[model samples]
Target: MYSAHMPAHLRCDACRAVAYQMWQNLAKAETKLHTSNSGGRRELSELVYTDVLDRSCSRNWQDYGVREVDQVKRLTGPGLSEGPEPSISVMVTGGPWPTRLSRTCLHYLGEFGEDQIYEAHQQGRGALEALLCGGPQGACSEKVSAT
Candidate 1:
């Protein structure tokens, strides 16, 4: 039986694919990621962050060509409220600074009980950087009509 929270835990396809590719690349260099070792098996967590970016330079967007979570944050406002003001509000970076880098989703999201629907740092330069993808529900948010 799925819990009330389980439904929201459903990851969008693009998020999954992006997460997978990012993980695949880092899997080779385990030290590059933030993971833990279990009693016998190693436990790896998929910490993926989303940020809205200016797709102008949209060739190999995956490339870490941008800097800081705010770069993309200011570009398009990600998801919740937060951009250059006026048109801001996109819940960028899970919550706020530093916490964005931390894997403690509880602290990041703050007060938000359901663990499954939480967000975290995805890709960034070295281990200190947190790549916040404005990447919302892979299912685009638009009112489409058959042409």
Candidate 2:
């Protein structure tokens, strides 16, 4: 059984983190494609993009953890950072946090089709965040009132 329960803010944070990592990986994949002799072939690019999407959720959650900043607990990791927010301390890591985050990422992908996400990705920075965390879903909100 997946024991971890994700609050609204954590879910939203995970979604944004997913978007951030996807963008970073996709950018690296594109760069490699451009430099290779294949000369940025469409099929190869799509293949790499698909792979990135597949692997994004499963790996790298270890870098993410809950930290309190300005009296609010926020998920921070990898491409997402706390910046100079005066984080109080690392409250959680490993354990169920990573598993829950991975599960949340998969759930988001299922809620929004991969094709749509890929298209949003192509639109460049902030598109994925808007699509995943913003709008009607309200995966992330200014104030989280419930678990």
Candidate 3:
């Protein structure tokens, strides 16, 4: 039970982080496809079928960490900022948090698989979040506010 040790807040943050990075990666791949000037049909086909989801769960965790803000251990990272504030926060490190987040991402991928994820991705913005965070098999509870 890897997720048992992860608090609800942390689990929500992990889900959000995974979705954010996946969207970023997908957008980058699509951008590259769109910018290619060469009209090679084979290259176009290859780019169209680019399997970005193959290694989407494997990502750099350098930007993610637990920051104590307002006397609470909050998960904070790029795209997961806690809003505009000048509060000085200390990032907690040297723990299993990173591994937990990684595992959570892989768990989602395992549970939903590539086809479902790709289908959700095609559904437009917030699709991944809805699927991975608010769907029936979501890791986070609907009652939990993602802030």
Candidate 4:
């Protein structure tokens, strides 16, 4: 049977795909990502962090090509009077910074989750880099969307 914690532990498809792409690119150079269990379930706690994963994990949309996270947060406002703002809401995988990147990429590409999802994943480092070269400002935002 599926466990409650298991469901919570499970990541979203886009997040998983993105992670896979990162893993694939770094797999050639990093041995730590290799499977440690022959038939057992591998746990996040069992994995070691690699520099590449660290770099990607640390990156944000402002660092890429857009600056919409703040505006989206500013314009969209809080979901409830008592609830935290959308930016602080745990509605996405990987928390705030990563959710910002995902949102920025979607805004630039005009895609929501699951639409051309593969294209986003296939964007690979290109998209990753595209999302990191700028901040949540105007000029670069227009330039990034145009590109």
TM-score of each: 0.20, 0.76, 0.71, 0.21
**How many times do residue backbones clash in model 4?**
8
- Give the per-residue lDDT of model 1 (tens digit) for 39-123: 5333344332221111111213222111234344221212222335554243322223222222222232332221222222222
Tens-place lDDT per residue, model 3, 1-147, is 344356775777778888777767666676776745454321223334336765666676667888876677778776675576576766875367767767777787777776676666656447877888885446655565566
**What lDDT, from 0 to 1, does candidate 4 have?**
0.34
| Local error of candidate 2 at residue 75 (angstroms) | 1.6
Count of clashing residue pairs in every prediction: 16, 0, 0, 8
lDDT of each residue in 1-147, candidate 2, tens digit only: 257667666777788788887777666766766735443332235566677777878876877888788798888776565465453466678877888887887877788877777778777658887888886546764565556
True-vs-predicted CA distance for residue 62, candidate 2, Å = 1.0
As for model 3, its CA RMSD to the true structure in angstroms is: 5.7
C-alpha lDDT values of all predictions? 0.27, 0.72, 0.67, 0.34
By lDDT, the best candidate is 2
Clashes of 2: 0
Q: Which ten residues in a row have the lowest lDDT in candidate 4?
A: 73-82
lDDT of 4 by residue, 18-97 (tens): 43444343444334556354434322221232334444433442321112353342112111124554454323333244
